[PDB]
């Protein structure tokens, strides 16, 4: 008979000794944020339909209004009609709410508060004095129960904990200046440092953003995506649940580090900033480096979203997790094969940074994301291929033999041996699947050992 | 288990199943508990006369000192004791003073042209592109699909019926700060006329004569939080949940006027939920006052969204609440304040909390709040013990479903949970297709 999964048995089966699975060498430096595609002047700009040379973003939106008025959901892709169209967009805008610029990145600004005293919850509660009584539990092992406890409720699908490796800090932050409003924002963007002092809370000073020492630790969160609306990349329902997950991500941010504050402690929430969320979830056993450069996890392969607070909360580190994802990435390449832009390697990893956007130093498949970000005008999207066609994104891709649970290889075979249909089709609360959600169920056992 | 089998079956024929009588008029919502003269003070357990609110943070510090997670509910240590109470701290960030109340201010605002959001969307100019989408059936399953991306595990759509909407709100003038609007608040006049927009003015809230419908959502509860009532845990829930109402409205409202139409949030403020969720469908009003639903009974938060986009309104429901909460009185018998009557519905009021001319179990919602500061919480013991809170209540006798007649906090934090709190065991319950969408 069929064995019922048991999402947490399987992650004890592929659980790693302590230690960082990231291998480096010496030509390892911490990476300026400016140097990301979305922000890096060489890459920044983009044509859009017409050639006319525009932030890459305002190019998408010119493709986007294109599309509706042409009755498409994506490039060649008719809608049932333009009102159908129209609606993809509605929800994709919608979904964008919490989140400033595309990914919450300026430390310290609107959503991302390194404290929380200025805060209208803050205020409110300020009588009862949480934020200022010391912490009445020190033991790593409570407070881990705590605090994941608090991360499920605050919209986690996942969580780990890891000690704060510097590597993936930014070396500086792209950000605004504390008296930029948010009109102008997007025209006054910054470089910032991000510098660790023996200061005893963090603190941004006009020429630093100042993490202190004692920042031990870093929680890694994610947030699932849903699959239907994923499958339909690189079509605007892709886009919509990317975006809702966004203003998910952020709202995750600020009640978690609400709590933590609550809790007698500090906390630096982040979204996309701050530092590199793939490497905190891998060393935080989320789950493992792809081919692509996502975090594979086991209940959701890549379709899942990252964010990350920072704290000095005593904590009990997770094991990092090895369940053969790099074996796999090594013979499949189908993201690769797929990927509109040829932007995914199918070669081998290196130490090796392929362009500007590539951290140099770490052991990875090495991408060409300037050549990614140019495909997003051209189809109007945040495209997402490459987290669609991913075998592991698909529901059913473990069995279990009667001694123990493996992956089903009949998954990766290659070859294999719409949206209306979306809007029409299944859906559940924030987009999550019911015949999935128990495998994110928690108990006090799994949360802490 | 069938959800949407059960819903189907227990379908009523159009129309409002409120009665009223022709003493009806719309309700003041100065008159709340909450925010009334004769009943916003509270003594402290010192014997110090505050805002109840105020009183209820002194009793929360008491007990967590005390190692306590409740009025004399020990706590394992003074460490739990704390954690449950920056749970439920943490749970308020998205809310502005218990409840989002006051209209246009804040999260709750009636236009999305100042919005983060809305200005960085502005060259795709969905807030101006006019509808392309005018029928009612389309609309209904684009709106309810984007409610549940939005958080909603409930909605339902409503005519809107006025009788619900306060006569006037409780808000703050336009340019007070927030670190002053506690002591700042005023009444302002709901009115509605024919103009293009929701605007407001120096003297009026004002809603247009083209806001047709009411898109209401039910926001679950965690179950074994709630049952933890009246200590920190059941707090904590209802803290969350409030936060996920804030996040909806914002959500739905940017989606509905990127659509093309308009939308105003409301969270607690602008009408009275239960009467909406009531003639929306989501379930029945019931002896303890609030609106039980097939799938979660009364534990489950309510918000709404009013707009002029065309939509077909759902059938009300009826699976025999009234007749049950008839007979029961549990919730009656077990409240700490005996704020809930055990006698029969009337149309007339017990006190000013009370809106009279609809016949209601009528409540005396004073001594409701009084508890509130001598517990430190937001209580929830009426929640916790309705048999319609319970799991499973829904048994099938092979033709058709009916309800089966028969039916500490250290272990919580110990014990299960999943993403906002939700249950996987019953998670399957608020799956949707379009079948039951519209
Ligand atoms: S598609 Fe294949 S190669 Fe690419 S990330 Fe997924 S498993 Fe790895
Ligand atoms: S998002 Fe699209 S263009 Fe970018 S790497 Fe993935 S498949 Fe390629
Ligand atoms: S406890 Fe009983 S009387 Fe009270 S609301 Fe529930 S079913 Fe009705
Ligand atoms: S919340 Fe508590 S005091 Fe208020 S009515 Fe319910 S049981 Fe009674």
Request: no cysteine; glycine share 8%; net charge negative.
């Given at each position: 008979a069929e064995k019922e999964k048991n999402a947490a048995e399987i992650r004890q089966q592929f659980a790693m000794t302590a230690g960082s699975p990231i291998i480096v060498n010496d030509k390892l430096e911490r990476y300026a944020e400016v140097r990301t595609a979305f922000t890096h002047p060489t890459s920044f700009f983009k044509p859009n339909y017409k050639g006319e040379v525009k932030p890459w973003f305002l190019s998408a939106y010119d493709e986007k209004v294109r599309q509706i008025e042409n009755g498409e959901n994506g490039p060649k892709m008719k809608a049932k009609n333009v009102g159908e169209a129209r609606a993809g967009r509605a929800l994709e805008a919608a979904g964008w709410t919490l989140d400033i610029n595309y990914g919450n990145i300026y430390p310290n600004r609107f959503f991302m508060l390194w404290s929380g005293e200025t805060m209208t919850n803050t205020q409110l509660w300020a009588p009862v004095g949480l934020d200022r009584r010391?912490?009445?539990?020190?033991?790593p092992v409570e407070l881990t129960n705590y605090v994941k406890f608090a991360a499920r409720m605050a919209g986690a699908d996942l969580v780990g904990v890891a000690r704060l490796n510097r590597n993936w800090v930014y070396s500086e932050a792209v950000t605004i200046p504390a008296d930029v409003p948010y009109e102008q924002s997007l025209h006054k963007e910054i470089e910032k440092p991000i510098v660790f002092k023996d200061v005893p809370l963090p603190i941004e000073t006009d020429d630093e953003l100042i993490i202190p020492n004692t920042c031990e630790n870093v929680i890694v969160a994610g947030i699932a995506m849903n699959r239907e609306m994923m499958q339909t990349a690189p079509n605007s329902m892709a886009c919509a649940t990317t975006a809702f997950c966004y203003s998910r991500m952020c709202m995750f941010d600020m009640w978690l580090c609400q709590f933590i504050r609550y809790m007698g402690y500090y906390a630096i929430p982040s979204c996309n900033g701050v530092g590199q969320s793939v490497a905190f979830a891998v060393e935080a056993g989320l789950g493992q480096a792809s081919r692509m450069g996502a975090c594979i996890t086991p209940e959701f392969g890549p379709n899942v979203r990252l964010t990350k607070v920072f704290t000095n909360m005593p904590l009990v580190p997770d094991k990092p997790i090895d369940f053969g994802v790099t074996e796999f990435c090594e013979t499949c390449k189908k993201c690769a094969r797929e990927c509109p832009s040829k932007a995914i390697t199918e070669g081998p990893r290196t130490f090796?940074?392929?362009?500007?956007?590539n951290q140099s130093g770490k052991l990875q498949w090495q991408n060409d994301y300037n050549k990614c970000l140019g495909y997003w005008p051209e189809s109007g999207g945040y495209c997402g291929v490459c987290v669609a066609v991913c075998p592991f994104t698909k529901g059913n891709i473990w069995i279990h033999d009667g001694v123990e649970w493996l992956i089903d290889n009949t998954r990766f075979l290659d070859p294999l041996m719409n949206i209306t249909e979306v809007w029409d089709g299944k859906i559940n609360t924030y987009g999550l699947d019911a015949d999935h959600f128990r495998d994110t169920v928690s108990f006090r056992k799994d949360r802490v050992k």
């Open positions: 010391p912490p009445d539990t020190t033991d090796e940074g392929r362009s500007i956007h």
